[PDB]
Amino acid sequence: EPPSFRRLRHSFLKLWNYNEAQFKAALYRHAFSSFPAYNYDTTAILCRCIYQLCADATSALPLNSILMLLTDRQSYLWRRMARLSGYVICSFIQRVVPIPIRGAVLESIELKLAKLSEEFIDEFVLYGRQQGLLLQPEDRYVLMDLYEWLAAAMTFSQKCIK
Amino acid sequence: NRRNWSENIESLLRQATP
Amino acid sequence: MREVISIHVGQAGIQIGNACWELFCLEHGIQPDGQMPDAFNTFFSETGAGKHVPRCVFLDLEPTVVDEVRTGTYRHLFHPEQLISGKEDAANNFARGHYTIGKEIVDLSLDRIRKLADNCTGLQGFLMFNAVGGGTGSGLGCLLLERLSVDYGKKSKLNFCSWPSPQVSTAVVEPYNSVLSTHSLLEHTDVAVMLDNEAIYDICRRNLDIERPTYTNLNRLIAQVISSLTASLRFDGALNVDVTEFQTNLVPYPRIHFMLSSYAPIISAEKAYHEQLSVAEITNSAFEPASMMAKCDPRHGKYMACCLMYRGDVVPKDVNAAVATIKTKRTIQFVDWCPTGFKCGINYQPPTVVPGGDLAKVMRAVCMISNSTAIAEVFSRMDHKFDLMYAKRAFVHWYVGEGMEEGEFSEAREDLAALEKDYEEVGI
Amino acid sequence: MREVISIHVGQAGIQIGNACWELFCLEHGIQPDGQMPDAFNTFFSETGAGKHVPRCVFLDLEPTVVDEVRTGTYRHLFHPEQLISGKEDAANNFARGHYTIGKEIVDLSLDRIRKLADNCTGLQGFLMFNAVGGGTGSGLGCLLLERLSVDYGKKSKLNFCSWPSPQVSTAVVEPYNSVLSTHSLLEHTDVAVMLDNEAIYDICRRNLDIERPTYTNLNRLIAQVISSLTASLRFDGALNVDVTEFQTNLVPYPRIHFMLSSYAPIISAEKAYHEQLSVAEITNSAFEPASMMAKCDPRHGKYMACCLMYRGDVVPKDVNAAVATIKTKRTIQFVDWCPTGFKCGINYQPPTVVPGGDLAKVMRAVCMISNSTAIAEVFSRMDHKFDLMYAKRAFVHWYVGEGMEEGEFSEAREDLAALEKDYEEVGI
Amino acid sequence: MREIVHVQGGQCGNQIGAKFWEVISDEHGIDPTGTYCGDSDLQLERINVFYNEATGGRFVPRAILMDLEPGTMDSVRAGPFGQLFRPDNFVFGQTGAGNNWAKGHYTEGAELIDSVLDVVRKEAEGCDCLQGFQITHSLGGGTGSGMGTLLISKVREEYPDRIMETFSVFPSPKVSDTVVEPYNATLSVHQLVENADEVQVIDNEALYDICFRTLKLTTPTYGDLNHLVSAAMSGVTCCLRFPGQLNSDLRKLAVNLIPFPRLHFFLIGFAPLTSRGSQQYRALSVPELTQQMFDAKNMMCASDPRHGRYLTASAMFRGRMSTKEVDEQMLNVQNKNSSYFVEWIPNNMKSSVCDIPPKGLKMSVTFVGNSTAIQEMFKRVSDQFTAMFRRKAFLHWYTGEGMDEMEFTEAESNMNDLVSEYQQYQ
Amino acid sequence: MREIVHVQGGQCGNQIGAKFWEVISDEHGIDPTGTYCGDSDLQLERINVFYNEATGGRFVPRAILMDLEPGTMDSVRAGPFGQLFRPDNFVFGQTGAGNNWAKGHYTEGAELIDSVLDVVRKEAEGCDCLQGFQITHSLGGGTGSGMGTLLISKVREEYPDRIMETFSVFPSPKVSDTVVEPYNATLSVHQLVENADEVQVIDNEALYDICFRTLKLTTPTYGDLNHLVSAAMSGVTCCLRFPGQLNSDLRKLAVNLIPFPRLHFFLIGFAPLTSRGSQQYRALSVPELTQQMFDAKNMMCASDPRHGRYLTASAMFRGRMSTKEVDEQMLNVQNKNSSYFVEWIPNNMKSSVCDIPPKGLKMSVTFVGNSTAIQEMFKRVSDQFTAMFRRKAFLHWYTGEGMDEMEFTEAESNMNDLVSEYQQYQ
Numbered sequence A: 001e002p003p004s005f006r007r008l009r010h011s012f013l014k015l016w017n018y019n020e021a022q023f024k025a026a027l028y029r030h031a032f033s034s035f036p037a038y039n040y041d042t043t044a045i046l047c048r049c050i051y052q053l054c055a056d057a058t059s060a061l062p063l064n065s066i067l068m069l070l071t072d073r074q075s076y077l078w079r080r081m082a083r084l085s086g087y088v089i090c091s092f093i094q095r096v097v098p099i100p101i102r103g104a105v106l107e108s109i110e111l112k113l114a115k116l117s118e119e120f121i122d123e124f125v126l127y128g129r130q131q132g133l134l135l136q137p138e139d140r141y142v143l144m145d146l147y148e149w150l151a152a153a154m155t156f157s158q159k160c161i162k
Numbered sequence B: 001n002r003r004n005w006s007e008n009i010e011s012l013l014r015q016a017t018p
Numbered sequence C, D: 001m002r003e004v005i006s007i008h009v010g011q012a013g014i015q016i017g018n019a020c021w022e023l024f025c026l027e028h029g030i031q032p033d034g035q036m037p038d039a040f041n042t043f044f045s046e047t048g049a050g051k052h053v054p055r056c057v058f059l060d061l062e063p064t065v066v067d068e069v070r071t072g073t074y075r076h077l078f079h080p081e082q083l084i085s086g087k088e089d090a091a092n093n094f095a096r097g098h099y100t101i102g103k104e105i106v107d108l109s110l111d112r113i114r115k116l117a118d119n120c121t122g123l124q125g126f127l128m129f130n131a132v133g134g135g136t137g138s139g140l141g142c143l144l145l146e147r148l149s150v151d152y153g154k155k156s157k158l159n160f161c162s163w164p165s166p167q168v169s170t171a172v173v174e175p176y177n178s179v180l181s182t183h184s185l186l187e188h189t190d191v192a193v194m195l196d197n198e199a200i201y202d203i204c205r206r207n208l209d210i211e212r213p214t215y216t217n218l219n220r221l222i223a224q225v226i227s228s229l230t231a232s233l234r235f236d237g238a239l240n241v242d243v244t245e246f247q248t249n250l251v252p253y254p255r256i257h258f259m260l261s262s263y264a265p266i267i268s269a270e271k272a273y274h275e276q277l278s279v280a281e282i283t284n285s286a287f288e289p290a291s292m293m294a295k296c297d298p299r300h301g302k303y304m305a306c307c308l309m310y311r312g313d314v315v316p317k318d319v320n321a322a323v324a325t326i327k328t329k330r331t332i333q334f335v336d337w338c339p340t341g342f343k344c345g346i347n348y349q350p351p352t353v354v355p356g357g358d359l360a361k362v363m364r365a366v367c368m369i370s371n372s373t374a375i376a377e378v379f380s381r382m383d384h385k386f387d388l389m390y391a392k393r394a395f396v397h398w399y400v401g402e403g404m405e406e407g408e409f410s411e412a413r414e415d416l417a418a419l420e421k422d423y424e425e426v427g428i
Numbered sequence E, F: 001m002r003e004i005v006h007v008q009g010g011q012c013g014n015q016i017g018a019k020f021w022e023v024i025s026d027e028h029g030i031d032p033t034g035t036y037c038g039d040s041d042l043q044l045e046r047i048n049v050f051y052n053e054a055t056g057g058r059f060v061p062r063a064i065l066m067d068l069e070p071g072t073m074d075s076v077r078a079g080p081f082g083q084l085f086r087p088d089n090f091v092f093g094q095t096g097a098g099n100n101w102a103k104g105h106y107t108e109g110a111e112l113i114d115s116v117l118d119v120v121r122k123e124a125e126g127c128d129c130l131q132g133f134q135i136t137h138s139l140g141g142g143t144g145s146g147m148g149t150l151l152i153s154k155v156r157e158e159y160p161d162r163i164m165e166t167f168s169v170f171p172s173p174k175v176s177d178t179v180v181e182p183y184n185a186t187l188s189v190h191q192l193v194e195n196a197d198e199v200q201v202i203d204n205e206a207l208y209d210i211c212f213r214t215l216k217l218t219t220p221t222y223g224d225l226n227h228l229v230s231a232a233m234s235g236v237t238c239c240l241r242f243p244g245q246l247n248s249d250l251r252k253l254a255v256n257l258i259p260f261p262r263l264h265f266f267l268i269g270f271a272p273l274t275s276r277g278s279q280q281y282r283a284l285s286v287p288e289l290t291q292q293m294f295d296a297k298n299m300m301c302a303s304d305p306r307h308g309r310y311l312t313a314s315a316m317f318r319g320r321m322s323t324k325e326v327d328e329q330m331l332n333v334q335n336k337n338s339s340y341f342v343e344w345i346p347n348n349m350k351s352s353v354c355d356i357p358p359k360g361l362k363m364s365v366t367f368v369g370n371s372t373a374i375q376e377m378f379k380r381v382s383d384q385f386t387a388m389f390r391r392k393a394f395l396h397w398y399t400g401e402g403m404d405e406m407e408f409t410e411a412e413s414n415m416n417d418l419v420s421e422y423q424q425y426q
């Protein structure tokens, strides 16, 4: 088990653990918000950057259809989030089983992730570091943990490519 | 006083003749 | 309770917006102070005692135009926070008006928009004026289009862009501006209406007999289009046709929502004295290819959908007797998969002429909004002008130095090129 | 019958008290001599025949502001020992205003407090206005609060504190006076209201369009806040929410009594001219974080309680509709364990407009006093300012040479950090 | 006794029934303020069929005014004979179906149809037992065909044995207003063929042809068209309100004109119709009445009866006439126009007389007739539907509202076998 | 004869009780000065039920106005029909409950309830045989919900077999005001089930709904809402003050609707209720009265009766109507809507007729119905009660003056068993 795919394994389990009602309202928070000015700038990038790599389709969609599928647990979006990270959601109680890329979608991810303002990049740096220190706002953590899955997926995919 | 001033339902509870 | 919010961005959005709000206040009878000496609420909000304020926002990134409105006559008509000014010119620059200096004014404008549209439920749509040639017209105007998409997803969005016409362009770098604008207004507006400057200049010359017009002369004619457009929401008619009807009847597939405009009659007092303005006559001049106000000859294209806003003393017998004439005439052609191909509406109120204007009193008029596959070539001339400059990195440092890097130019290339192929495959 | 005894300690207390009593004399219609040209018994006594004197003490160690009060316009309006002066100032020291020079003026202040409280049984409580960052406002504030607690235990002691606003302080030693002030008023103040300069400044910036307000422009705003609260005690209304009703409905736990304020609409002549100030629109605008009066953001705070006082021609049905619309409006979130979170009150008499001031004729106005867990941020940043203060003994030799030893700063740190984790555990 | 709760959907429905209650109130002698005038007992013995007592002596119509946009209902209320309707029978929407059958039927007519079932059950259960419902709406619109046919379906499961009758205007061949005509028309005809008992078919281009060729009206407005339809709507219900020598209730029209339960599509005519300058020049008796109603220029549909065969026809005469010339003047057109009538049904044709004529005329007749000639009107809306469906046009407005392409496809298959069972009878 | 002693608890009960004493005063022709006018026998034939002679000819109400603040006392007195009350019947409070059930029931309600019981027994023993008391208050306050129910307990132990009728204005699901609603409500109801014969729930937002959709008001005030309640409780006591063909008192009504002593909470509806344009357009008859009464929008309570079973019911008609039509309409609403009625009681409802209608109505009806569909109120204030109680919220404004946690625990335990008793009878 490679560490790159293990980071994918750990990242998904955070978003699956987060409550469906809380992550519903929190994801809608950062889209309709105005305060600190980075906030929707991360939302438009990241919410699309989920669906771009998780559908392997370079075409974009309206944001309202993106948002609903990002949080509806039995949707196609979480379905392929599972398959990329080595999981399958199995609806019975949706217990999830730990099972063992087009060129054009790649630069769409790369170009627009490099639009995330200087805020979102370096709270992501400190958030991983303070997670370790805590072991030794609940709103803003939702996008940041969504970028756990993006960073794990994008790095692992290019590792298999090269 | 003007906390309870119903000048409309006191006449809605009688047959109006417009 | 119908209501329409009239968003204006860019200098063309403001200056066109001054003419239509002049027309709306004059038609609805309210003085420039705001008080008239009950279906005006689509454009005017009640404010205490007998007062009616417009439902609009003014947006420039400069004080040079908006502050002059506060200095002008309609200063107590418009709410002060409705007119919003930045400081520095967006400077014909999509990148600066979308990434750099627009962010400090989007938060002000959207706070006003929410505070102005949440006053009454049953909002009807967002009517938007902008110029894709200009910097804050294309850049800031694009930015509010994501804002109104994520905030009000299901709401109608009418857009009226002043596209750079082929020969007359009045600037240099708008072959870069309007390709970046059309990349992001494909997925962020519901109906786009094509308007070119020389396409209204040439109407002023052959019809108004004006050899030396100005921008405000054009903005009277654009204001006449909008007034007959939202005429049914304000006045009772025989066949009311709201702006929800435009999307259900003129856009058959969500990408191809661009559509042209026309108006007839455009006559001054020296020819309404002699013309009989029959319903069949004014609709044939509306269908006349030289009468387009989008600079696009429809004879080298195929009509796809059609919409006519009759306005005045128009009996429904004559609209049917005239639409049969345009069906049988061969030089106009429709697409083979839209046999039923017309939408018509009649409002009882005659058009209103502004005193001092170059138009004349007309007892009936036709607004003319039609979708056709002929709009491919106006994107094609746009593609050739952009490809000429982009072959050797011209004016690119003025876009890449302000936050966006290389790649949005190529995405705008691929999205517009895909729009050409989409127009072609529909038209077969 | 019912009455309230205003206390005004500190220079902020003197000047805010001037605006509150100028407003109150203007409300009940009494000249500066105290005559008229039983709704005034809450603030004014019936002294003699036709004369009215306030129920307020002006406890201040600066003679240069309160001798200047007793020589100005209202010099015959106040009884001469309502206005109480020291000899030398505390000069932004908690220790001097509480230990050395404050003990010779509390003994004379309580002479007037008992002599005015025994006028009639039926008192609701005290309205103590003070400056936290000051020395007389905080040092004498602590000493006066504990003598009021030991003598009048069950009385509702309210506090309107001029907290040091986060980025502008007009002092250097303000974190010492503010940490030692909370150590007093957590155990003493029943209901505390967060006021600060900077949030009142920028609501004068954006709502009154005044680019430079002085302190008295702030003082009109705070005067209208206390006027809207205590209008229930003076004028009859549909829901009279008394001082006793405040402390039950806003305090879920006795340690947390730190509420923020908002007063809307606050509009000048230009923009009392273009709105309808309907109840839904003026209760949304009260709830905007921009209209907060503490520079504290409710976006990263969870609401616990929220009181809304209304004045003017306010219909209860549109109040109940609007407070439902703000509950379904989900930018503000209420805490899970307190689903119902509202205490509304309606008064019919609108606030009379101060002439020559900065606000205009408003038919209906909303005051709001709300508890939230966002109070953590207004205590955490003064904690970070204070722990680099006390790191290497800056400005400590003044305090320790005044009568209190090293160590009282430490338990002032421990009980405020206990207050921090108290606010964290509530919103879980 | 008998009772017909009129139900009115769509903008066209409300304007066509503002004039329906105009001529019914005239025929019964009713002031716009509900007071009776005209001192004759023969209007008021059966006023419960279309009106109700309102304990003040005025008569409220049993009309369920229904729309999704507040505009045209403000027009009918402000018009003459407009305050006659009771205010709570108006049911309003705030957004309005934008000529979209998907959103009218499914996503925004559903929260309003709950109030509509409330207001129609207000007046159905108020009487002892009614006869049926009549619904006037469009099939080219959104609020009429989308949400009004949702009412047509739901009242069928709750009131199964009762007979419901629709006066629908259809899309026109030549003049095509409201560009999505066949999408709203084929989907409505699908749901209406198993949820209706009589379908009287109206076409606006046929109304313009009647107003020009027979009435010589140079400027026909929509009120002129609505007069013509409503005159036929009074003649189809004459016997339920007035006596006659041979009475026929409206159920008698259903049993006689329907040989097979799946075919109930009719063609409507009205006679006499004479130009104002030619009124005194033309004799008015039964032979001149019957020679007019069997003419395509007198018919209210875009279908020539000579191109098909009359399966079963009917006439509702009106006024003082002889039953003799009702018999052989109706029979001599059978044995002269022998080829135009179907062979495997003898005596194809129902005759009834309702002794009270309409006002201003001494006799009249209303033609309700099942004909195979309706075939080409069905073919024209069908092949325009497949014209736009083979290229996937305009379907995102429908499938984006909670629809799927299912409801288009078996609408088409249920439409072409409606074609096949008609085309097998000629 | 039989007298009913009215008590107004809290500032809500004072305003909705002053509205009662001007509509009864108008019904009996009494001027606000107490002088009679209206020269009819039947108005003064039974005036001792609500009024007492004052040896000067003016009638004084048997009403004890009682509260903890003088805020609404001087508004009642200075209002119209305000000088009718005896000034000695007022009991002022000076401290005022801070909307605390503890501060009403325990702290200053102790030293004030001895000053209310001395005038309650004064009004009770003044007549020969008292029928009972009616009390009117809200369950969201401190002085009405907390100390008003303190009076209810001690009038029970002093007058056991007298009827104790309660008009409780229950707190709101949706639009919550006076933020400690469930703390005042749950503590009141668990003490009120043991000490009340009849309880009638009234919800402000249901009155808001009635004022919006059925009556069409644009500017509703509290005096509007209070007049719905007052006119409703005038129909409950019609037969006590006026002759009828079928009489019914409060003790008559309690036998009908109480199969078991735990469940005594009722729904109240008043018919007819029509708007301005609609009042001249409807026929005022029995079948529309019972149809507008057996529906959710006319109930003065925010619980839908169709979400459960009507366990028992009653209707006090008023006017000169048929006894035939009253009884047949009771059989029709049971036979058609049989699913909404419980099966182990044949003929769940009953009726009565009071020959004197309300002034300005030819005929009216009030409805008192014990249903198991009202359990949704009890659960939705239970889950709000447990929302704050689970982590000790606002409890220090109750435990600091003499109430402990174990009778808070008894509060929900006496609250869930009420819901469980309703579950087993459904």
Ligand SMILES: Nc1nc2c(ncn2[C@@H]2O[C@H](COP(=O)(O)OP(=O)(O)OP(=O)(O)O)[C@@H](O)[C@H]2O)c(=O)[nH]1
Binding pocket: C009, C010, C011, C012, C013, C015, C016, C060, C089, C090, C091, C092, C093, C131, C133, C134, C135, C136, C137, C138, C162, C164, C169, C170, C171, C197, C215, C216, C218, C219
């Ligand atoms: N029809 C019409 N077009 C106008 C008017 N004013 C400006 N324009 C057009 O707008 C285009 C340039 O954009 P502007 O609106 O002037 O400038 P902008 O949108 O404010 O953006 P900036 O240049 O950065 O300030 C020109 O091509 C003009 O043709 C007007 O009043 N009417």
Ligand SMILES: Nc1nc2c(ncn2[C@@H]2O[C@H](COP(=O)(O)OP(=O)(O)OP(=O)(O)O)[C@@H](O)[C@H]2O)c(=O)[nH]1
Binding pocket: D009, D010, D011, D012, D013, D015, D016, D060, D062, D089, D090, D091, D092, D093, D131, D132, D133, D134, D135, D136, D137, D138, D162, D163, D164, D169, D170, D171, D196, D197, D215, D216, D218, D219
């Ligand atoms: N809002 C408001 N705050 C004031 C005003 N005047 C003074 N303050 C506050 O008072 C603080 C300083 O204390 P002062 O009131 O000036 O002085 P003091 O209370 O008399 O006590 P000393 O500091 O010992 O002089 C400043 O930081 C301000 O925050 C005023 O007019 N309005």
Ligand SMILES: Nc1nc2c(ncn2[C@@H]2O[C@H](COP(=O)(O)OP(=O)(O)O)[C@@H](O)[C@H]2O)c(=O)[nH]1
Binding pocket: E009, E010, E011, E012, E013, E015, E016, E097, E099, E138, E140, E141, E142, E143, E144, E145, E169, E177, E178, E204, E222, E223, E225, E226
């Ligand atoms: N006969 C008649 N037809 C009408 C009238 N108004 C509209 N129509 C027809 O209805 C069609 C427009 O659809 P419409 O009924 O307005 O849409 P709807 O409001 O959603 O039902 C047009 O083709 C008209 O021919 C009317 O008053 N009378």
Ligand SMILES: Nc1nc2c(ncn2[C@@H]2O[C@H](COP(=O)(O)OP(=O)(O)O)[C@@H](O)[C@H]2O)c(=O)[nH]1
Binding pocket: F009, F010, F011, F012, F013, F015, F016, F097, F099, F138, F140, F141, F142, F143, F144, F145, F169, F171, F177, F178, F204, F222, F225, F226
């Ligand atoms: N129906 C009705 N409800 C009222 C009235 N006044 C107050 N209320 C309700 O009572 C609740 C507040 O209780 P309140 O009477 O003010 O407190 P109290 O003085 O301690 O009884 C609010 O939820 C109001 O909805 C009234 O006149 N009529």
Ligand SMILES: [Mg+2]
Binding pocket: C091, C092, C093, C094, C132, C133, C134, C135, C136, C138, C173, C174, C177
């Ligand atoms: Mg530009």
Ligand SMILES: [Mg+2]
Binding pocket: D091, D092, D093, D133, D134, D135, D136, D137, D177
């Ligand atoms: Mg100081």
